[PDB]
Amino acid sequence: NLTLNFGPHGVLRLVMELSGEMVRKCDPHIGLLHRGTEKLIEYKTYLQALPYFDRLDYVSMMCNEQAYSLAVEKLLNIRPPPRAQWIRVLFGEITRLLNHIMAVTTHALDIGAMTPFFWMFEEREKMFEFYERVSGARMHAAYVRPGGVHQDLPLGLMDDIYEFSKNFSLRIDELEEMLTNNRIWRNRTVDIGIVTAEDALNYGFSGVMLRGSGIQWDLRKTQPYDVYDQVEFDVPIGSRGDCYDRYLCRVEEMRQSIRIISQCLNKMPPGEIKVDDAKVSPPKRAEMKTSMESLIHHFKLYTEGYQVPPGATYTAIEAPKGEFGVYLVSDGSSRPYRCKIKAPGFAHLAGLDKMSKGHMLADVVAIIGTQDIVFGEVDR
């Protein structure tokens, strides 16, 4: 049994035991991007900790913000206003497109199919513009916050999102022309990394790692949040539990994301975009500069921060990579006592050795890709 100290998002050290072509052992050595996020959060106010979540699955920034915001809102016993909830669903699904493009095209690029990366990353650049227009940043928006969102949509943004969405399914079609029926792509993915429904559950998998194996589970349907119960979409389900089925699930989820985006554009309601409660959400600048109460609350919200009633919650969402949750503990003060980040890729990568059984070295690249691993969230 030969041993390799490194074979094949971030940086991974894979220690593998080989026998000819076959992988006998796969021991991932992570922590190469462990930056003590969970400890740093204990020294921050709840608002100050929000940007740390952009930098976890740093391909799914606003989905990560949503999970943290929902957790804080639950502990605060407040709720974001309806328009903020629709904006949060709209950008969550835009973020899903951002993630799935990265997931599928870098998965293809890793095994030699380099061209779809370029086609789809021009679509990513256009969605980076939607991020920048609402938040001023292309990636780490810090836009979704406990109590709603930071600012309202600028005039004209919704029109451009409609223009982008109208053409996007054709871009998916071109991606499918390159990969879906290509015999080389199928050879690299079909019957690779098969996981049974029972093993997937017991190994802590979530998201496409479950649905690829036939399990009918999606937190947007079963445990819905902000307004997911008000939009219509289908959950793609696999039948073989392999990389190819998980590739197909992700491609179909992009189509369903566009379907959701179309509904969010049409049903976007009027109103304020953060909770009309100035002990949680900062007042408008014009009020802060005229009213005594508003100025005090602005001063206190940006120095001490709001206190959160003591308690603990496990809150999770259906992030693009699977179930993303935080176990957030409040001690009553304005700083969290503990914040454990449940990253779906942590359990998934823990299952690499199991999934790589009976496969060749080049299949490990395919299996890592099918899991969609970003070491920002694995290592935290």
Partner: protein
């Protein structure tokens, strides 16, 4: 509600079997993949001619920091330290004292641009629009030390960029 992505039975009649044999032997699906890359060769590329052309940005863009003045030239910053308090990265350092005319002003205002996460929380917290993130993003340096901004650097940034900063603030302040 759900759908199946890959649950279909191939037709086992002779016509269908011969269709798949022709695909296997004549590489038809591979030739169809060649058609798509051929059509891209003849599309206009998406590349822009940087630095002669620039990517589009919005007034909200969070770039290089600057300290602003009133129209009279007086500094807006009154050393309240709200920005320093909110800064998620502890990138801001402030000292203050009464100015010779009794005004509440800073003697130190530093931003470590290599600690800063360019989050914009400082410009939200500021009650007087004194500290902003400006539109400049082309300020890479040859040394680490050049990115440790003191108050003189930040005031110079404000005087340098105020024309554009004011117009950008004019376009977005009703959303704030």
């Amino acid at each position: 509600t759900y759908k199946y992505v890959n649950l279909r039975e191939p037709s086992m009649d002779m016509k269908s079997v011969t269709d798949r044999a022709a695909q296997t032997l004549l590489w038809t699906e591979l030739i169809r993949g060649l058609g798509m890359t051929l059509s891209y060769l003849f599309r206009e590329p998406a590349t822009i001619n940087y630095p002669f052309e620039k990517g589009p940005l919005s007034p909200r863009f969070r770039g290089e920091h600057a300290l602003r003045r009133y129209p009279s030239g007086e500094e807006r910053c009154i050393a309240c330290k709200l920005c320093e308090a909110v800064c998620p990265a502890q990138a801001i350092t402030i000292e203050a004292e009464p100015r010779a005319d009794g005004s509440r002003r800073t003697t130190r205002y530093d931003i470590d641009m290599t600690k800063c996460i360019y989050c914009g929380f400082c410009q939200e917290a500021c009650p007087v629009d004194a500290i902003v993130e400006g539109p400049n993003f082309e300020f890479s340096t040859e040394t680490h030390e050049e990115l440790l901004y003191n108050k003189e650097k930040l005031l110079n940034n404000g005087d340098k960029w105020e024309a554009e900063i004011a117009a950008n603030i004019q376009a977005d302040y009703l959303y704030r």
